Structure formats: C-alpha cells, structure tokens
C-alpha cells in the first residue's frame, strides 16, 4: 500500500503469503489453530501473523513511514492436523530484524503476547519455533554443556545420579545437611534443594548453603568421588539471586539451580551468563511447565520451552520421566530430548519436530528425569535417556528402609548394573528384572529396595 486510507481492513490482504519462501534468517513458528466455526483459515492464520508482528486492528498511517513488506510477519503455509479436522497448522515466518538479539524474552513475548487471547480461535497452541542459526549465535546458551560438565566433575561412562531432599519443606539447615551428607556418601553424584526451598523461616538460605557445603565436602572426602548439591538461588529480586549465587561460588559450591519459568527468563538469562563467567554449573527446574504445556489444544508445547531454555542457558533441564508417558507422547518426549542435547535435529512430524533445528556449536544440556521413580525404573530410564542424563531419586533414596546412605547405594548399584548390562549388549528393558535381581544378590541395599517398592 502506498496511500493512507483509514478504517478496518482484513488481515488476509497483507499477512497471508502462500507463495512466500522463508529465508534462512527467518524465525518460523508453527501454531495449531482451533478456530471458531465461521472464521476462515487463511484469515485466522493472517490474524495470528499480524498481531504477533506488525499488524493492527485498524489501518494506521505510520505503516507508510516504514516498509511493512520487509518487517511484517507472514503466514505462508496452512496444513491439516492429522486426525483432527477442527484444527489446522499455520506456519508463520518472522524476519530476524523483529527481535532483540540474544533475547529469548523478546522472541517469546512477541510470539505468545496476545494472539492466545483471540476470540476468533477456540484454542491456540504454539507447536514449534525454528530458531535460525544466525539468531542462535546471538544467545549465550548453556554456560558449560554436557561435555564441559563431565570434564569439570570428572564423571564419565554413565548417567549421573541425583536426589531431591525430602520433605520439600520443614527441615532445619543442619538437618538438611545431614540428609545431604548421607545421600552423597552413599553413592549419589548430586543432591538438590527442592524447587520450593529458597529462604524460609525454618531454614535461611545462608545457613543452608553453609551446612550443605560442609556436607558435600565431607562426603567427597569419604568417597573419593566429586559431589555437588544444587543450591537454589531462586530469589525475590535479581539482587538477591546474584547474592546467593556469589555466596555459593565463594564457599566452593560447584552447582546451583534456578526455576526459569517462575523465576523468569530475564533472571535466568542473567544467571546463565553469570554462571559462565564464574564457572558454576546451572541446573534448571521447569516449575509451571504443566500450567502451560499440558493442554494439547491451548498453550505452548514443552518442545518450544525446551528450545528457549537451551538458548537462555542451563547445564541441566528437568524433562520429566517418559516411563509414565504413553507411546504417543513418548516419541514427542524423545523429540525434545534430542532438541536439548543434539547439534542438528532434522524435521520429523512423527516426533512433533516441525522444522529442522540447527544448534551449531551451542552445547547440549543434560536431560534430568525425576518423579516417583525407584530402582525398578532404572532399566527403562537408562534405555530411554542414555548416558548424558541425570536420574534423580528423591523419595527413592530418602524412602529406603535403611536411610539415605543405603538408598543411595541401592540406586547407584542399580544404575551401574543397568549400564554394565547395556554395554554388554543385553536388552536392559526386556531383561530389567533379571539384571536387577542379579545385582541384588551382591547388594543387600538394592535387595530390600526392590522389596520396598513394586515392579
């Protein structure tokens, strides 16, 4: 358009470009639109493209001051949703110039800011986002990544083992350290603060960090293996968050943890840069993901949140446990684990991967499994996740009949037996019981652990 004509106009006239070929620099988004009957697909797609980028509900003269053809987001492909005729996939291209470089915040705000509120759609689901390599290079990414972390902690050949201290709340700092000490001395690589553990009247953070570090060092001396505890630095303000991170560095804590959604992307990105500058590993908890990621018709798929975390920065990311998930959602889970860890993920619709995602040199992130998992889950966990994973057994350790040290040893024996059997070429999931039963003959801890919880 070259002349200014005021009034309301249809989004399709400008934001639906079926013949557009996305550039390599473009950010691409796949939205699953469940529109209200009566609204046209192209118009729904164009409306999402316009409102997420440069469009307005009515024509504004200021558009003529700039070149909307260059800047505008454009819907370029419509596809059916397999097996769901109420919904369709809209593919929208966004010029890279629309986004602040190195800002997952800005890109996220633009894509999810207000399109989710449209009365035209019954539901809007952001399925996938193609971050071009040019954008990826502007982002800090994981402060260390899988390989650097293994070198720093001198851990090779197996998944790492972790435990969340339980109960989630209520323990004093000294008792918290006692629980940490017992878990670590028994064979866990890591222990962690619960996501809810920040600084509470029952346990102030500085007291917690001191006792935990004492526990970590004592266990490390007594086992001859490196140990860590993810100290939660999630805090009310950035100043408080950095203060806690600095104290962890000062006392020699190798790893800290943060809640990137609840704490927020701005805080997380700053923390990730701080972690890289100070050599501290960063474990990321995904609290609130289920609020946003569960509903298949409305929200954001976790795979998108996974990509944002890798760009924002974390050395570990909580990924849930595939054991609970059904086979339909298993392939999707394997999909985002590849996104978390691999360098190049090719497009694969069966796994929910709508775009080729190139990470280039950006390091991979440890996948973290947790939940109500215990020794019996070990074979399936080792199979699904592989070596570059952290398996966290909170209840499965502190709930052992003989205490944390025995529970840790039971999990450690189960893990090592599964790994040894895998390396020998056995099908660990098929032979899981036999493997665990054989290992239990040499470990009373594993034996009673297998009796405590059911297969």
């Amino acid at each position: 358009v070259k002349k200014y004509s005021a009034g309301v106009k249809e989004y399709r006239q400008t934001y639906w470009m079926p013949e557009y070929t996305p550039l390599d620099s473009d950010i691409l988004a796949c939205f699953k639109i469940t529109p209200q009957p009566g609204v046209d697909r192209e118009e729904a797609a164009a409306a999402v493209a316009a409102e997420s980028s440069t469009g307005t509900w009515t024509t504004v003269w200021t558009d003529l001051l700039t070149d909307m053809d260059y800047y505008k987001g454009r819907a370029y492909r419509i596809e059916d949703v397999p097996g769901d005729d109420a919904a369709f996939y809209a593919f929208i291209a966004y010029p890279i110039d629309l986004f602040e470089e190195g800002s997952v915040v800005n890109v996220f705000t633009s894509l999810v800011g207000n399109v989710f509120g449209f009365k035209a759609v019954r539901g809007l689901r952001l399925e996938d986002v193609r971050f071009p390599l040019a954008y990826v290079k502007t982002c800090g990414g994981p402060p260390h990544g899988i390989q650097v972390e293994r070198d720093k902690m001198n851990k090779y050949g197996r998944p790492l083992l972790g435990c969340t201290i339980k109960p989630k709340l209520g323990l004093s700092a000294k008792n918290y350290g006692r629980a940490v000490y017992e878990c670590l001395r028994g064979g866990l690589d890591f222990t962690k603060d619960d996501e809810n553990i920040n600084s509470q009247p029952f346990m102030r953070w500085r007291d917690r960090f001191l006792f935990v570090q004492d526990a970590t060092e004592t266990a490390e001396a007594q086992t001859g293996e490196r140990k860590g505890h993810y100290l939660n630095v999630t805090a009310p303000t950035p100043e408080e968050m950095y203060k806690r991170a600095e104290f962890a560095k000062e006392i020699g804590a190798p790893i800290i943890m943060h809640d990137y959604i609840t704490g927020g992307f701005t805080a997380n990105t700053g923390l990730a840069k701080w972690c890289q500058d100070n050599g501290v590993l960063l474990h990321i908890h995904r609290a609130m993901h289920a609020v946003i990621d569960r509903n298949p018709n409305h929200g954001i798929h976790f795979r998108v949140l996974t990509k944002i975390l890798r760009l924002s920065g974390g050395d570990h990311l909580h990924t849930g446990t595939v054991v609970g998930k059904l086979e339909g959602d298993r392939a999707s889970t394997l999909g985002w684990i590849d996104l978390l860890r691999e360098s190049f993920i090719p497009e694969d619709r069966s796994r929910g991967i709508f775009f080729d995602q190139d990470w280039g040199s950006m390091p991979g992130v440890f996948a973290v499994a947790s939940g109500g998992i215990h020794v019996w889950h070990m074979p399936a966990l080792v199979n699904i996740f592989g070596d570059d994973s952290v398996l966290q057994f909170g209840g499965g350790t502190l709930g052992h009949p003989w205490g944390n040290a025995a529970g840790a040893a039971a999990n450690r024996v189960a893990l090592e037996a599964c790994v040894e059997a895998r390396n020998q070429g056995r099908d660990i999931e098929k032979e899981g019981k036999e493997i665990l039963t054989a290992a239990a003959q040499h470990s009373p801890e594993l034996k009673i652990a297998m009796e405590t919880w059911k297969e």
């Binding site: 550039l23 070149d67 260059y70 010029p95």
Partner: peptide, 9 residues
C-alpha cells in the same frame, strides 16, 4: 537505502 536492496529483495 537500507531495506530497499536486501538479500530478500
């Protein structure tokens, strides 16, 4: 200038 002769154009 600037946007007139971009790679896309």
């Amino acid at each position: 200038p600037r946007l007139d002769l971009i790679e896309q154009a």
